[PDB]
Design an enzyme around this catalytic site. Structure first.
Site, PDB file in Angstrom:
ATOM      1  N   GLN A   1     -72.228  19.055  37.644  1.00  0.00           N
ATOM      2  CA  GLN A   1     -71.526  18.213  38.036  1.00  0.00           C
ATOM      3  C   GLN A   1     -71.976  17.984  39.029  1.00  0.00           C
ATOM      4  OE1 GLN A   1     -68.075  20.762  36.775  1.00  0.00           O
ATOM      5  NE2 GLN A   1     -67.383  19.216  38.460  1.00  0.00           N
TER       6      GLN A   1
ATOM      7  N   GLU B   1     -69.750   4.715  40.727  1.00  0.00           N
ATOM      8  CA  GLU B   1     -70.367   3.186  40.744  1.00  0.00           C
ATOM      9  C   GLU B   1     -69.283   2.444  40.032  1.00  0.00           C
ATOM     10  OE1 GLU B   1     -73.625   3.515  42.248  1.00  0.00           O
ATOM     11  OE2 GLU B   1     -74.572   5.238  41.391  1.00  0.00           O
TER      12      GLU B   1
ATOM     13  N   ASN C   1     -70.452  25.724  30.516  1.00  0.00           N
ATOM     14  CA  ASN C   1     -69.383  25.293  31.793  1.00  0.00           C
ATOM     15  C   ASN C   1     -70.774  24.314  31.973  1.00  0.00           C
ATOM     16  OD1 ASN C   1     -67.948  24.397  34.346  1.00  0.00           O
ATOM     17  ND2 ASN C   1     -68.234  26.370  34.915  1.00  0.00           N
TER      18      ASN C   1
ATOM     19  N   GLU D   1     -75.298  10.564  38.955  1.00  0.00           N
ATOM     20  CA  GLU D   1     -74.787  10.148  40.560  1.00  0.00           C
ATOM     21  C   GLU D   1     -73.789  11.209  41.080  1.00  0.00           C
ATOM     22  OE1 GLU D   1     -77.467   8.853  42.405  1.00  0.00           O
ATOM     23  OE2 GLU D   1     -78.569   7.951  40.997  1.00  0.00           O
TER      24      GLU D   1
ATOM     25  N   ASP E   1     -56.093  16.159  18.744  1.00  0.00           N
ATOM     26  CA  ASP E   1     -55.692  16.858  19.584  1.00  0.00           C
ATOM     27  C   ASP E   1     -54.782  18.221  18.777  1.00  0.00           C
ATOM     28  OD1 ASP E   1     -55.989  15.758  22.621  1.00  0.00           O
ATOM     29  OD2 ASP E   1     -53.697  15.680  21.661  1.00  0.00           O
TER      30      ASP E   1
ATOM     31  N   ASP F   1     -51.042  26.288  33.410  1.00  0.00           N
ATOM     32  CA  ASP F   1     -51.627  25.320  34.547  1.00  0.00           C
ATOM     33  C   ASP F   1     -53.040  25.225  34.902  1.00  0.00           C
ATOM     34  OD1 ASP F   1     -51.025  24.012  36.532  1.00  0.00           O
ATOM     35  OD2 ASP F   1     -51.505  25.479  37.913  1.00  0.00           O
TER      36      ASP F   1
ATOM     37  N   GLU G   1     -77.063  27.225  18.220  1.00  0.00           N
ATOM     38  CA  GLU G   1     -78.201  28.516  16.876  1.00  0.00           C
ATOM     39  C   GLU G   1     -78.682  26.563  16.463  1.00  0.00           C
ATOM     40  OE1 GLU G   1     -76.757  32.924  16.857  1.00  0.00           O
ATOM     41  OE2 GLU G   1     -75.896  30.935  15.505  1.00  0.00           O
TER      42      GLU G   1
HETATM   43  C1  LIG Z   1     -63.077  19.508  37.315  1.00  0.00           C
HETATM   44  O1  LIG Z   1     -64.246  18.581  37.927  1.00  0.00           O
HETATM   45  C2  LIG Z   1     -62.023  18.813  37.545  1.00  0.00           C
HETATM   46  C3  LIG Z   1     -61.364  18.603  38.774  1.00  0.00           C
HETATM   47  C4  LIG Z   1     -60.280  18.878  39.570  1.00  0.00           C
HETATM   48  C5  LIG Z   1     -60.576  16.727  39.942  1.00  0.00           C
HETATM   49  C6  LIG Z   1     -60.309  16.917  41.502  1.00  0.00           C
HETATM   50  N1  LIG Z   1     -59.514  17.955  42.194  1.00  0.00           N
HETATM   51  C7  LIG Z   1     -60.002  18.582  41.233  1.00  0.00           C
HETATM   52  O2  LIG Z   1     -60.061  20.429  41.457  1.00  0.00           O
HETATM   53  N2  LIG Z   1     -60.685  18.931  36.683  1.00  0.00           N
HETATM   54  C8  LIG Z   1     -60.243  17.693  35.961  1.00  0.00           C
HETATM   55  O3  LIG Z   1     -60.448  16.823  36.188  1.00  0.00           O
HETATM   56  C9  LIG Z   1     -58.871  18.271  35.240  1.00  0.00           C
HETATM   57  C10 LIG Z   1     -59.825  18.557  34.098  1.00  0.00           C
HETATM   58  C11 LIG Z   1     -58.198  18.946  32.981  1.00  0.00           C
HETATM   59  C12 LIG Z   1     -59.380  19.084  31.124  1.00  0.00           C
HETATM   60  C13 LIG Z   1     -57.269  20.521  33.168  1.00  0.00           C
HETATM   61  N3  LIG Z   1     -58.300  17.203  35.281  1.00  0.00           N
HETATM   62  C14 LIG Z   1     -56.910  16.388  36.812  1.00  0.00           C
HETATM   63  O4  LIG Z   1     -57.609  17.075  37.534  1.00  0.00           O
HETATM   64  C15 LIG Z   1     -56.808  15.618  36.141  1.00  0.00           C
HETATM   65  C16 LIG Z   1     -56.004  14.346  37.437  1.00  0.00           C
HETATM   66  C17 LIG Z   1     -56.264  13.775  36.983  1.00  0.00           C
HETATM   67  C18 LIG Z   1     -55.167  12.232  37.966  1.00  0.00           C
HETATM   68  C19 LIG Z   1     -54.655  11.454  36.814  1.00  0.00           C
HETATM   69  C20 LIG Z   1     -54.322  11.357  35.526  1.00  0.00           C
HETATM   70  C21 LIG Z   1     -54.954  12.307  35.563  1.00  0.00           C
HETATM   71  C22 LIG Z   1     -56.130  13.259  35.723  1.00  0.00           C
HETATM   72  N4  LIG Z   1     -56.096  14.201  35.854  1.00  0.00           N
END
Ligand SMILES: *[C@@H](O)[C@H](C[C@@H]1CCNC1=O)NC(=O)[C@H](CC(C)C)NC(=O)c1cc2ccccc2[nH]1
Ligand SMILES: *[C@@H](O)[C@H](C[C@@H]1CCNC1=O)NC(=O)[C@H](CC(C)C)NC(=O)c1cc2ccccc2[nH]1
Lengths: 215, 214
Positions: A19, A96, A182, A92, A114, A160, A9
């Site tokens: 995405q 790339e 999201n 995209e 954090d 997790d 707001e």
């Molecule tokens: C959301 O788009 C994404 C989905 C995963 C990527 C591959 N398959 C999936 O289901 N999630 C992430 O990118 C998560 C997000 C965090 C905040 C929980 N992080 C990772 O999966 C991820 C992979 C990876 C590899 C190396 C270093 C860091 C790292 N984080």
């Protein structure tokens, strides 16, 4: 603290983005939090480039469409000394070559914070700072099919998490919730948002890996 | 209509291409409009073959590297029953023999629509249809050398268009069309230009706009 907050707001939040078929949730989370902090600073809301993060933040530990972390993205912007606008470096849904161009830089950051792994701390941060990047457990059918009300999934993990999103507020039903943006498009959920259970045992891990950029 | 539209973030637009030293702008514009409408129909974004248009759309009136029109390219795809993918029929920036092969066709059309010759009608099409093929007067040094902001050239003409491009959206900073060129990513803003909108049909952007029906 206020019992309800909605930064949308107040001009801090861009429209919902999508995405596509790419695990770039972390980049959308990061750009949302930086959009918020750049607005706080400058009073201008400018959509930022997730593509720039996807293509250029490998050195900081990110893996493009294979996943990544908002804090790694914040570190990239600091290391890089800038981040391009969405309009100049469009999304995209793939990886790339890095095409960062300082000409079109419209954001920067000086680090990140954090947040303590406490819903109370997250609430304080949302109230005082702005939109906050968070990791959730999103890997349940109830979350795909979410349409309305407060989301609670008894099989959600607080440890997790697999999905990066953005908390833009919180409140209650006239039974508290976080207001979460999201990156699955406006057709998903409630205009692309979900009300997730707040103060219910750190539900789906929303306070476990929360952070925001400093600017 | 919305005050801002950008189809690139919605998956309708391929990366910027480069025509090289060939007057094939019309072919890149046409493939862009068809990539968007094929995405609208199927949810798949597949880069289409400009070379297939250059080589094969002579019967519909096109002249390869010596010029052409997007509507003649849409007529070819209709007449032909298909268009090959970029990856199958790569771009050579010169005219070759027609090597069209239906095995590799990944697009079709049923016809094409010309948009009313007004910027208001163009805006409605962009908002409701997707990326739109347009002709502009690009023959000014200002355009040749654009880098940012909203492009406006006093000496631009609204009836002497000489360049085919693709409108992927519009917005405001003072309004603009977001326009995908085919001069590579080093030109302009990552290959794009924001062109003055609602200022005397600037550079003739609404004079010859069209899109394929799929
Ligand atoms: C959301 O788009 C994404 C989905 C995963 C990527 C591959 N398959 C999936 O289901 N999630 C992430 O990118 C998560 C997000 C965090 C905040 C929980 N992080 C990772 O999966 C991820 C992979 C990876 C590899 C190396 C270093 C860091 C790292 N984080
Ligand atoms: C852009 O690559 C191209 C450049 C010209 C062709 C060679 N010399 C040029 O500078 N421009 C065109 O192909 C334009 C585009 C339209 C949309 C304005 N079209 C023509 O020049 C054109 C159309 C056409 C039809 C039949 C025969 C000749 C012919 N030339």
């Amino acid at each position: 603290a206020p019992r309800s907050v909605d930064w949308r707001e107040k001009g801090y939040v861009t429209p919902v983005k999508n995405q596509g078929q790419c695990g770039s949730c972390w980049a959308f989370s990061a750009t949302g939090a930086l959009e918020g902090q750049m607005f706080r600073k400058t009073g201008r809301l400018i959509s930022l480039s997730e593509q720039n993060l996807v293509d250029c933040s490998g050195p900081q530990g990110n893996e493009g469409c294979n996943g990544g972390l908002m804090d790694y993205a914040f570190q990239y912007v600091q290391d890089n000394g800038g981040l391009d606008s969405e309009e100049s470096y469009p999304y995209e849904a793939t990886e790339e070559s890095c095409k960062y161009n300082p000409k079109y830089s419209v954001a920067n950051d000086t680090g990140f914070v954090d947040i303590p792994k406490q819903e109370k701390a997250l609430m304080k941060a949302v109230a005082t700072v702005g939109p906050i990047s968070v990791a959730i457990d999103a890997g349940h059918e109830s979350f795909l099919f979410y349409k309305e009300g407060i989301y609670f999934e008894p099989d959600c993990s607080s440890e997790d998490m697999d999905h990066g999103v953005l908390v833009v507020g919180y409140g209650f039903e006239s039974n508290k919730y976080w207001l979460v943006k999201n990156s699955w498009g406006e057709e998903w959920g409630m205009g692309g948002y979900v009300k997730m259970a707040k103060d219910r045992r750190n539900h789906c891990g929303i306070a476990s890996a929360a952070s925001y950029p400093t600017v």
